[PDB]
Protein backbone atom coordinates (compact mmCIF):
# COMPACT_ATOMS: atom_id res chain seq x y z
CA UNK A 1 0.00 0.00 0.00
CA UNK A 2 2.41 2.66 1.25
CA UNK A 3 5.84 1.63 -0.18
CA UNK A 4 4.93 1.89 -3.86
CA UNK A 5 3.11 5.18 -3.28
CA UNK A 6 6.14 6.50 -1.38
CA UNK A 7 8.32 5.57 -4.36
CA UNK A 8 5.79 7.36 -6.57
CA UNK A 9 6.08 10.43 -4.33
CA UNK A 10 9.87 10.40 -4.70
CA UNK A 11 9.28 10.19 -8.45
CA UNK A 12 6.96 13.21 -8.20
CA UNK A 13 9.60 15.16 -6.29
CA UNK A 14 12.19 14.38 -8.96
CA UNK A 15 9.73 15.38 -11.68
CA UNK A 16 9.12 18.72 -9.96
CA UNK A 17 12.86 19.29 -9.66
CA UNK A 18 13.32 18.55 -13.36
CA UNK A 19 10.36 20.72 -14.42
CA UNK A 20 11.75 23.67 -12.46
CA UNK A 21 14.19 23.98 -15.41
CA UNK A 22 17.04 25.07 -13.18
CA UNK A 23 20.49 25.43 -14.71
CA UNK A 24 21.54 22.33 -12.76
CA UNK A 25 18.77 20.32 -14.41
CA UNK A 26 19.69 22.01 -17.71
CA UNK A 27 23.29 20.79 -17.44
CA UNK A 28 22.17 17.35 -16.23
CA UNK A 29 19.69 17.06 -19.12
CA UNK A 30 22.68 17.07 -21.48
CA UNK A 31 24.67 14.52 -19.45
CA UNK A 32 21.77 12.00 -19.61
CA UNK A 33 21.99 11.81 -15.80
CA UNK A 34 18.41 12.95 -15.19
CA UNK A 35 17.12 10.44 -17.75
CA UNK A 36 18.64 7.41 -16.03
CA UNK A 37 17.91 8.72 -12.52
CA UNK A 38 14.24 9.17 -13.46
CA UNK A 39 14.44 5.70 -15.01
CA UNK A 40 15.68 4.14 -11.78
CA UNK A 41 13.05 6.00 -9.72
CA UNK A 42 10.13 4.85 -11.88
CA UNK A 43 11.61 1.35 -12.07
CA UNK A 44 11.60 1.16 -8.27
CA UNK A 45 8.03 2.49 -8.29
CA UNK A 46 6.90 -0.17 -10.77
CA UNK A 47 8.68 -2.99 -8.93
CA UNK A 48 7.02 -1.99 -5.65
CA UNK A 49 3.63 -1.73 -7.37
CA UNK A 50 3.87 -5.15 -9.02
CA UNK A 51 5.11 -6.68 -5.76
CA UNK A 52 2.06 -5.29 -3.94
CA UNK A 53 -0.19 -6.60 -6.73
CA UNK A 54 1.44 -10.04 -6.58
CA UNK A 55 0.92 -10.17 -2.81
CA UNK A 56 -2.73 -9.16 -3.25
CA UNK A 57 -3.13 -11.98 -5.79
CA UNK A 58 -1.31 -14.35 -3.43
CA UNK A 59 -3.96 -13.71 -0.76
CA UNK A 60 -6.89 -13.98 -3.19
CA UNK A 61 -9.64 -16.14 -1.71
CA UNK A 62 -11.85 -18.81 -3.28
CA UNK A 63 -11.70 -17.12 -6.68
CA UNK A 64 -12.80 -18.35 -10.08
CA UNK A 65 -9.93 -18.64 -12.53
CA UNK A 66 -11.41 -16.32 -15.16
CA UNK A 67 -12.26 -13.57 -12.66
CA UNK A 68 -8.75 -13.67 -11.17
CA UNK A 69 -7.25 -13.56 -14.67
CA UNK A 70 -9.40 -10.55 -15.57
CA UNK A 71 -8.57 -8.66 -12.35
CA UNK A 72 -4.85 -9.29 -12.80
CA UNK A 73 -5.18 -8.13 -16.41
CA UNK A 74 -6.91 -4.93 -15.26
CA UNK A 75 -4.09 -4.12 -12.84
CA UNK A 76 -1.45 -4.98 -15.44
CA UNK A 77 -3.13 -2.79 -18.06
CA UNK A 78 -3.23 0.15 -15.65
CA UNK A 79 0.46 -0.33 -14.84
CA UNK A 80 1.35 -0.61 -18.53
CA UNK A 81 -0.50 2.62 -19.35
CA UNK A 82 1.60 4.24 -16.63
CA UNK A 83 4.68 2.66 -18.25
CA UNK A 84 3.69 4.00 -21.69
CA UNK A 85 3.34 7.57 -20.46
CA UNK A 86 6.61 7.17 -18.50
CA UNK A 87 8.49 5.96 -21.55
CA UNK A 88 7.08 8.79 -23.66
CA UNK A 89 8.33 11.28 -21.07
CA UNK A 90 11.77 9.67 -21.03
CA UNK A 91 12.08 9.52 -24.83
CA UNK A 92 10.98 13.13 -25.21
CA UNK A 93 13.51 14.28 -22.60
CA UNK A 94 16.21 12.50 -24.59
CA UNK A 95 14.90 14.13 -27.78
CA UNK A 96 15.01 17.53 -26.07
CA UNK A 97 18.65 16.93 -25.16
CA UNK A 98 19.47 15.91 -28.73
CA UNK A 99 17.54 18.87 -30.21
CA UNK A 100 19.26 21.39 -28.00
CA UNK A 101 22.34 19.63 -29.35
CA UNK A 102 21.07 20.95 -32.71
CA UNK A 103 22.94 24.16 -31.85
CA UNK A 104 25.56 22.12 -29.92
CA UNK A 105 25.54 23.46 -26.38
CA UNK A 106 23.18 26.42 -25.99
CA UNK A 107 19.40 26.41 -25.51
CA UNK A 108 16.92 29.20 -26.16
CA UNK A 109 14.53 30.70 -23.60
CA UNK A 110 11.28 29.58 -25.28
CA UNK A 111 12.02 25.96 -26.20
CA UNK A 112 12.29 25.71 -22.41
CA UNK A 113 8.71 26.95 -22.07
CA UNK A 114 7.46 24.51 -24.72
CA UNK A 115 9.24 21.61 -23.02
CA UNK A 116 7.84 22.83 -19.69
CA UNK A 117 4.24 22.81 -20.91
CA UNK A 118 4.82 19.32 -22.33
CA UNK A 119 6.24 18.20 -18.96
CA UNK A 120 3.30 19.71 -17.07
CA UNK A 121 0.71 17.93 -19.22
CA UNK A 122 2.79 14.75 -18.87
CA UNK A 123 2.82 15.15 -15.08
CA UNK A 124 -0.95 15.62 -14.97
CA UNK A 125 -1.64 12.54 -17.09
CA UNK A 126 0.93 10.56 -15.08
CA UNK A 127 -0.88 11.49 -11.87
CA UNK A 128 -4.20 10.42 -13.39
CA UNK A 129 -2.76 7.10 -14.59
CA UNK A 130 -1.00 6.36 -11.30
CA UNK A 131 -4.17 7.07 -9.34
CA UNK A 132 -6.21 4.77 -11.57
CA UNK A 133 -3.48 2.17 -11.00
CA UNK A 134 -4.10 2.58 -7.28
CA UNK A 135 -7.84 2.28 -7.95
CA UNK A 136 -7.31 -0.98 -9.85
CA UNK A 137 -5.19 -2.20 -6.93
CA UNK A 138 -8.01 -1.36 -4.52
CA UNK A 139 -10.49 -3.22 -6.73
CA UNK A 140 -8.09 -6.17 -6.69
CA UNK A 141 -8.54 -6.37 -2.89
CA UNK A 142 -11.98 -7.96 -3.25
CA UNK A 143 -13.69 -11.17 -4.33
Amino acid at each position, epitope marked *: NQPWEQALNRFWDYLRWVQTLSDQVQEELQSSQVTQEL*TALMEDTLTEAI*AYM*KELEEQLGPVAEETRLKLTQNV*IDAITNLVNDMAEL*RNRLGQYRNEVHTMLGQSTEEIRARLSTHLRKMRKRLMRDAEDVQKALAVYKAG
Partner: antibody
Amino acid sequence: QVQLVQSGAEVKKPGSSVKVSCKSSGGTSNNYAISWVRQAPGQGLDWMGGISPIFGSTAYAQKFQGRVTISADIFSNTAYMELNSLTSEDTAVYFCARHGNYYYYSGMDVWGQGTTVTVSS
Amino acid sequence: SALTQPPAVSGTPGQRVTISCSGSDSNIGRRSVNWYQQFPGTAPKLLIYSNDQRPSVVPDRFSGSKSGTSASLAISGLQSEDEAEYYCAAWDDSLKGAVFGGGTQLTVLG
Protein backbone atom coordinates in the same frame (compact mmCIF):
# COMPACT_ATOMS: atom_id res chain seq x y z
CA GLN B 1 -1.91 -3.41 -36.07
CA VAL B 2 0.76 -4.10 -33.47
CA GLN B 3 3.59 -6.04 -35.10
CA LEU B 4 6.59 -7.90 -33.70
CA VAL B 5 9.76 -7.17 -35.69
CA GLN B 6 12.91 -9.20 -35.02
CA SER B 7 16.59 -8.53 -35.63
CA GLY B 8 18.36 -9.67 -38.78
CA ALA B 9 19.95 -13.02 -39.53
CA GLU B 10 22.91 -14.28 -37.49
CA VAL B 11 25.87 -16.43 -38.54
CA LYS B 12 27.90 -17.61 -35.54
CA LYS B 13 30.80 -19.99 -34.81
CA PRO B 14 30.47 -22.88 -32.33
CA GLY B 15 31.13 -21.68 -28.80
CA SER B 16 29.87 -18.10 -29.13
CA SER B 17 26.53 -16.60 -28.05
CA VAL B 18 23.69 -14.90 -29.91
CA LYS B 19 21.26 -12.16 -28.85
CA VAL B 20 17.95 -11.80 -30.73
CA SER B 21 15.59 -8.87 -30.18
CA CYS B 22 11.84 -8.47 -30.62
CA LYS B 23 10.37 -4.96 -30.94
CA SER B 24 6.67 -4.08 -30.79
CA SER B 25 5.72 -1.55 -33.48
CA GLY B 26 2.39 0.25 -33.47
CA GLY B 27 1.65 -0.56 -29.84
CA THR B 28 2.94 -1.96 -26.57
CA SER B 29 3.18 -5.64 -25.62
CA ASN B 30 4.22 -5.15 -21.99
CA ASN B 31 0.80 -6.24 -20.69
CA TYR B 32 1.16 -9.56 -22.57
CA ALA B 33 3.48 -12.56 -22.36
CA ILE B 34 6.19 -12.87 -25.03
CA SER B 35 7.57 -16.37 -25.57
CA TRP B 36 10.44 -17.53 -27.77
CA VAL B 37 9.85 -20.60 -29.96
CA ARG B 38 12.60 -22.10 -32.10
CA GLN B 39 12.30 -24.41 -35.11
CA ALA B 40 15.21 -26.43 -36.46
CA PRO B 41 15.30 -26.86 -40.26
CA GLY B 42 12.77 -29.59 -41.02
CA GLN B 43 11.84 -30.12 -37.35
CA GLY B 44 8.91 -28.95 -35.26
CA LEU B 45 8.38 -26.08 -32.86
CA ASP B 46 10.32 -25.99 -29.59
CA TRP B 47 9.48 -23.70 -26.67
CA MET B 48 12.54 -22.05 -25.10
CA GLY B 49 11.02 -19.65 -22.58
CA GLY B 50 9.00 -16.50 -22.11
CA ILE B 51 8.58 -13.30 -20.16
CA SER B 52 5.79 -10.98 -19.07
CA PRO B 53 7.60 -7.96 -17.60
CA ILE B 54 4.69 -6.07 -16.02
CA PHE B 55 3.55 -9.26 -14.29
CA GLY B 56 7.22 -9.91 -13.49
CA SER B 57 7.50 -13.49 -14.74
CA THR B 58 10.40 -14.94 -16.75
CA ALA B 59 10.03 -18.70 -17.29
CA TYR B 60 12.43 -21.06 -19.06
CA ALA B 61 12.18 -24.51 -20.58
CA GLN B 62 14.18 -27.13 -18.70
CA LYS B 63 16.30 -27.94 -21.77
CA PHE B 64 17.57 -24.37 -22.20
CA GLN B 65 17.51 -22.95 -18.66
CA GLY B 66 21.26 -23.36 -18.25
CA ARG B 67 21.97 -21.53 -21.52
CA VAL B 68 19.14 -19.12 -22.45
CA THR B 69 18.51 -15.74 -20.84
CA ILE B 70 15.26 -13.89 -21.60
CA SER B 71 14.83 -10.23 -20.65
CA ALA B 72 12.85 -7.15 -21.63
CA ASP B 73 13.20 -3.38 -21.84
CA ILE B 74 9.71 -2.02 -21.16
CA PHE B 75 10.52 1.61 -22.01
CA SER B 76 11.59 0.67 -25.55
CA ASN B 77 8.91 -2.07 -25.85
CA THR B 78 11.52 -4.72 -26.65
CA ALA B 79 12.16 -8.30 -25.59
CA TYR B 80 15.49 -10.11 -25.82
CA MET B 81 16.65 -13.72 -25.93
CA GLU B 82 20.33 -14.56 -25.48
CA LEU B 83 21.47 -18.12 -26.23
CA ASN B 84 24.93 -19.10 -24.99
CA SER B 85 27.29 -22.00 -25.77
CA LEU B 86 26.11 -22.27 -29.36
CA THR B 87 26.78 -25.52 -31.22
CA SER B 88 25.85 -26.78 -34.67
CA GLU B 89 22.71 -28.25 -33.06
CA ASP B 90 21.31 -24.73 -32.50
CA THR B 91 20.94 -23.59 -36.13
CA ALA B 92 17.25 -22.79 -36.38
CA VAL B 93 14.66 -20.05 -36.87
CA TYR B 94 13.69 -18.17 -33.70
CA PHE B 95 10.23 -16.61 -33.44
CA CYS B 96 8.92 -14.33 -30.72
CA ALA B 97 5.18 -14.76 -30.17
CA ARG B 98 2.75 -12.79 -28.02
CA HIS B 99 0.18 -14.63 -25.93
CA GLY B 100 -3.44 -13.55 -25.52
CA ASN B 101 -3.04 -12.53 -21.87
CA TYR B 102 -0.26 -11.79 -19.38
CA TYR B 103 0.68 -15.49 -18.98
CA TYR B 104 1.82 -18.38 -21.18
CA TYR B 105 -1.34 -20.52 -21.08
CA SER B 106 -3.21 -18.61 -23.79
CA GLY B 107 -2.58 -18.99 -27.50
CA MET B 108 0.11 -17.06 -29.35
CA ASP B 109 -1.77 -14.90 -31.85
CA VAL B 110 0.84 -12.29 -32.89
CA TRP B 111 4.10 -13.57 -34.37
CA GLY B 112 7.31 -11.98 -35.56
CA GLN B 113 8.94 -12.74 -38.88
CA GLY B 114 11.61 -14.97 -37.35
CA THR B 115 15.39 -14.71 -37.03
CA THR B 116 17.59 -17.25 -38.81
CA VAL B 117 20.53 -18.32 -36.63
CA THR B 118 23.16 -20.43 -38.40
CA VAL B 119 25.93 -21.93 -36.24
CA SER B 120 28.71 -23.52 -38.26
CA SER B 121 32.47 -24.06 -38.13
CA SER C 1 7.97 -33.22 -27.64
CA ALA C 2 5.50 -34.70 -25.14
CA LEU C 3 2.52 -34.50 -27.54
CA THR C 4 2.06 -36.98 -30.38
CA GLN C 5 0.61 -36.29 -33.83
CA PRO C 6 0.45 -38.38 -36.99
CA PRO C 7 3.24 -37.03 -39.21
CA ALA C 8 1.25 -37.13 -42.48
CA VAL C 9 -2.45 -36.67 -43.29
CA SER C 10 -4.04 -36.49 -46.74
CA GLY C 11 -7.45 -35.69 -48.19
CA THR C 12 -9.32 -34.79 -51.38
CA PRO C 13 -10.84 -31.32 -51.92
CA GLY C 14 -14.22 -30.96 -50.25
CA GLN C 15 -13.45 -33.79 -47.82
CA ARG C 16 -13.39 -33.35 -44.04
CA VAL C 17 -10.17 -34.50 -42.36
CA THR C 18 -8.97 -34.67 -38.75
CA ILE C 19 -5.64 -34.29 -36.96
CA SER C 20 -5.22 -36.13 -33.66
CA CYS C 21 -3.11 -34.98 -30.71
CA SER C 22 -2.66 -37.40 -27.80
CA GLY C 23 -0.96 -36.27 -24.60
CA SER C 24 -0.61 -37.23 -20.96
CA ASP C 25 -2.29 -36.44 -17.63
CA SER C 26 0.07 -33.49 -17.14
CA ASN C 27 -0.24 -31.54 -20.42
CA ILE C 28 -3.71 -32.11 -21.89
CA GLY C 29 -5.42 -33.64 -18.85
CA ARG C 30 -5.33 -30.31 -17.00
CA ARG C 31 -4.46 -27.61 -19.56
CA SER C 32 -6.16 -26.41 -22.73
CA VAL C 33 -4.78 -27.21 -26.18
CA ASN C 34 -3.96 -24.67 -28.90
CA TRP C 35 -3.60 -25.36 -32.62
CA TYR C 36 -1.24 -23.49 -34.95
CA GLN C 37 -0.95 -23.57 -38.74
CA GLN C 38 2.36 -23.00 -40.55
CA PHE C 39 3.04 -22.59 -44.26
CA PRO C 40 6.48 -23.27 -45.78
CA GLY C 41 8.73 -20.31 -45.04
CA THR C 42 6.33 -18.33 -42.83
CA ALA C 43 5.60 -17.85 -39.14
CA PRO C 44 2.93 -20.04 -37.52
CA LYS C 45 -0.61 -18.68 -37.22
CA LEU C 46 -2.86 -19.27 -34.22
CA LEU C 47 -5.73 -21.40 -35.53
CA ILE C 48 -7.52 -22.66 -32.39
CA TYR C 49 -7.29 -21.72 -28.71
CA SER C 50 -9.00 -23.12 -25.58
CA ASN C 51 -9.58 -26.33 -27.62
CA ASP C 52 -12.65 -24.94 -29.41
CA GLN C 53 -12.32 -21.16 -29.97
CA ARG C 54 -11.53 -19.58 -33.32
CA PRO C 55 -9.85 -16.22 -33.88
CA SER C 56 -12.03 -13.84 -35.86
CA VAL C 57 -10.03 -14.37 -39.07
CA VAL C 58 -10.07 -18.19 -38.90
CA PRO C 59 -12.99 -19.58 -40.95
CA ASP C 60 -15.50 -21.89 -39.31
CA ARG C 61 -14.21 -24.73 -41.52
CA PHE C 62 -11.66 -25.34 -38.74
CA SER C 63 -13.01 -26.76 -35.48
CA GLY C 64 -11.43 -28.14 -32.34
CA SER C 65 -12.32 -30.63 -29.64
CA LYS C 66 -10.78 -32.03 -26.46
CA SER C 67 -11.65 -35.30 -24.71
CA GLY C 68 -9.72 -36.25 -21.58
CA THR C 69 -6.15 -36.89 -22.68
CA SER C 70 -6.68 -36.25 -26.41
CA ALA C 71 -7.44 -33.34 -28.73
CA SER C 72 -8.65 -33.20 -32.31
CA LEU C 73 -8.60 -30.60 -35.07
CA ALA C 74 -11.18 -30.91 -37.85
CA ILE C 75 -10.72 -29.26 -41.25
CA SER C 76 -13.90 -29.46 -43.32
CA GLY C 77 -14.34 -28.20 -46.86
CA LEU C 78 -10.71 -29.03 -47.59
CA GLN C 79 -9.07 -26.66 -50.08
CA SER C 80 -5.68 -26.58 -51.78
CA GLU C 81 -4.77 -23.55 -49.62
CA ASP C 82 -4.81 -25.81 -46.54
CA GLU C 83 -1.65 -27.73 -47.52
CA ALA C 84 0.48 -26.83 -44.50
CA GLU C 85 1.80 -28.12 -41.18
CA TYR C 86 -0.43 -28.23 -38.10
CA TYR C 87 0.98 -28.18 -34.56
CA CYS C 88 -0.87 -28.82 -31.32
CA ALA C 89 0.46 -27.15 -28.19
CA ALA C 90 -0.27 -27.28 -24.48
CA TRP C 91 1.26 -26.55 -21.09
CA ASP C 92 2.88 -29.44 -19.20
CA ASP C 93 2.99 -29.09 -15.41
CA SER C 94 5.39 -32.03 -15.05
CA LEU C 95 7.81 -30.16 -17.34
CA LYS C 96 6.55 -26.74 -16.15
CA GLY C 97 6.61 -25.41 -19.69
CA ALA C 98 5.00 -25.26 -23.10
CA VAL C 99 5.07 -28.40 -25.25
CA PHE C 100 4.29 -28.88 -28.94
CA GLY C 101 3.45 -31.83 -31.15
CA GLY C 102 5.63 -33.29 -33.87
CA GLY C 103 3.58 -31.48 -36.51
CA THR C 104 1.23 -32.97 -39.10
CA GLN C 105 1.86 -32.28 -42.80
CA LEU C 106 -1.60 -31.85 -44.33
CA THR C 107 -1.41 -32.47 -48.08
CA VAL C 108 -4.35 -32.20 -50.49
CA LEU C 109 -4.69 -34.78 -53.26
CA GLY C 110 -5.80 -34.06 -56.82
